[PDB]
Amino acid sequence: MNIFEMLRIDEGLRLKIYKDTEGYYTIGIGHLLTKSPSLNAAKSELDKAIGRNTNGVITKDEAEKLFNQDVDAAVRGILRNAKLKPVYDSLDAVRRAAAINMVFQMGETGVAGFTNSLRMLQQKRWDEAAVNLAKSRWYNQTPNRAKRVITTFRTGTWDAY
Numbered sequence: 001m002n003i004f005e006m007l008r009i010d011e012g013l014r015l016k017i018y019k020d021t022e023g024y025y026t027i028g029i030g031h032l033l034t035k036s037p038s039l040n041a042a043k044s045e046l047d048k049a050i051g052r053n054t055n056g057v058i059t060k061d062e063a064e065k066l067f068n069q070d071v072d073a074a075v076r077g078i079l080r081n082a083k084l085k086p087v088y089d090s091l092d093a094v095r096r097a098a099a100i101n102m103v104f105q106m107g108e109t110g111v112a113g114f115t116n117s118l119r120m121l122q123q124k125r126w127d128e129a130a131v132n133l134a135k136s137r138w139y140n141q142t143p144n145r146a147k148r149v150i151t152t153f154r155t156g157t158w159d160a161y
């Protein structure tokens with residue numbers, strides 16, 4: 001298990017445009033296309049992302065290419081964020097994957113707002129952090145996924161996957 005296999009479990013793989021848990025047009029392994037309600041707008045973002053006229057369908061190779069880019073972008077975003085980077089650097093590699101998972105799902109804006117959880121994580125108060133992380137819209141709207149990510153923060157193991 002690693003961050004790629006973790007997010008592949010949490011996000012699935014779909015090769016046609018679909019709506020994510022929030023109703024937003026998405027493709028591949030959780031590649032958000034747009035928050036616009038226009039499917040045509042989503043298809044335009046897809047063509048721009050892939051570099052060809054797709055009409056809403058991509059290959060698994062293409063999905064994995066966007067996925068690798070999106071994981072990389074999530075990490076690089078964490079490392080540019082003054083709130084997230086010190087907490088991320090304080091973590092072991094397994095909990096680092098949990099941090100990337102949250103940023104992948106929620107965006108660095110939003111995760112940087114988890115101020116009290118971030119402090120508990122930096123302090124390695126794992127059970128306290130896990131309790132605070134669940135007091136969130138994130139947990140309430142995607143509880144099974146949030147429980148897996150939280151268990152990874154709580155234990156530093158891959159037991160939930």
Ligand SMILES: CCB1C=CC=CN1
Pocket residue numbers: 078084085087088098099100102103111114117118121
């Ligand atoms: C709140 C989880 B987290 C997300 C990025 C960096 C550190 N921690």
Ligand SMILES: [Cl-]
Pocket residue numbers: 048049050066069
């Ligand atoms: Cl791209």
Ligand SMILES: [Cl-]
Pocket residue numbers: 141142143144145146
């Ligand atoms: Cl869920």
